[PDB]
Paper text:
The function of CPR-C4 as a cysteine protease was predicted through remote structural similarity to the Homo sapiens vasohibins and subsequently confirmed experimentally with fluorescence-based activity assays.
The CPR-C4 protein, including an N-terminal His6-tag, crystallized in two space groups with different crystal morphologies but similar resolution limits. Crystal form 2 diffracted to a resolution of 2.68 Å in space group I222, with one polypeptide chain per asymmetric unit, and was solved by molecular replacement with the model from crystal form 1. However, the absence of other metal cations in the zinc-free crystal structures implies this is not a promiscuous site, and the tetrahedral ligand arrangement is strongly preferable for Zn2+ binding over other transition metal cations or the sodium and potassium present in the buffers used.
Numbering used by the authors:
A (entry chain A), B (entry chain A): 1 to 38, 45 to 217
Write the structure that this text describes.
């Protein structure tokens, strides 16, 4: 309630009217679906203004909306080899089970229903669909290597990220530097099989055109 | 070794030459990739003859090839609502971790690398990608509800399935009747969100044409 009070001090009437509607994790994901998928690392304020977001911008807005209704604003980092880019989601729980809100342009690394018994279990549900699909060089290689502990944005003064103008590279870097848990050892990595051609083709589909 | 001996008594020279090559789970999956995806429920013999298979025909051949190299021939049933069809995979383990060999025509319910710490964890990696994609009626509804214990085909005389002529509906029925574990309760089911339009479109892609 205290955290929510701090948020209300920072937000305009329009912002609060939006956040008030987004009262369930499902409603939040529905809202992110209407934002155009994509320089900089916008605040939730900027995202609501310009209605454009990459993954971490999407997750930060989700975390804000979750916090506005009394959930912890939690991020999880999905960390890849240098061949790929990391992905960030907003974690949530309902009746003891983990779910995830996700902003992505492709049919992989999507929303997760609150049915996963642990962070690990949820994270593992992404592994098989995190692969190189955009080039033939290591075509189909599975690139996920680690997941973060839930990253609680409560540790910061909300001004620092909710309404920031300053570009939040520091926040991205803090997330990347937090505790991560490896998914493989060296033996397991050697076992990995590439995704099939049908899988890479499917992953390549786009929600929003690359205009 | 005893089980393998029984298999060798039943198999032709050609059959054994094939099974001898398929010495890793990865090699087996590669082989199933060359079989055309699809009445009846053919034996591994029939599948090797006609080079055509649905999911359970694929999994039984996989289980045979696994057994020929000393693994348990294990099946896992993935059980859906009445709106969908069940799917069967062949489970395997390498260094204490579960993987799965799978025969499917679509970019979902595919192979799983041996990295999953439990049957449950592996089964849960399929949940989000098991949905209605072929009609608008309950379009995108997530239909997986339970997974079986590993089903060891060792319980039967190998003649009964490896080289059967008789159509193996009884084997399918025995699998469906084995111990299953629910994934949801009624509360969780009410939380479920439909897959997106981009997801149903991606799932609809076909490896083999529907000629």
């Amino acid at each position: 309630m205290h955290y929510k009070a701090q948020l209300q001090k920072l937000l305009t009437t329009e912002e609060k009217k939006i956040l008030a509607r987004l009262s369930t994790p499902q409603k939040i994901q529905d809202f992110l679906d209407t934002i155009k998928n994509k320089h900089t690392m916008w605040s939730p304020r900027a995202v609501l203004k310009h209605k454009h977001a990459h993954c971490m911008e999407g997750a930060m807005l989700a975390a804000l909306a979750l916090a506005y209704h009394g959930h912890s604003p939690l991020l999880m980092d999905l960390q890849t080899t240098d061949e790929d880019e990391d992905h960030v989601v907003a974690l949530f729980k309902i009746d003891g089970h983990w779910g995830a809100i996700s902003k992505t342009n492709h049919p992989v690394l999507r929303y997760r229903d609150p049915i996963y018994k642990s962070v690990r279990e949820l994270a593992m549900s992404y592994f098989h669909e995190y692969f190189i699909w955009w080039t033939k060089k290591n075509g189909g290689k599975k690139t996920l290597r680690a997941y973060s502990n839930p990253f609680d944005l409560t540790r910061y003064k909300p001004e620092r990220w909710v309404i920031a103008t300053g570009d939040l590279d520091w926040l991205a870097e803090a997330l990347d530097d937090s505790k991560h848990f490896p998914i493989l050892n060296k033996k397991m990595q050697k076992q990995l099989r590439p995704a099939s051609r049908i899988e890479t083709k499917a992953a390549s589909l786009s929600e929003w055109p690359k205009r």
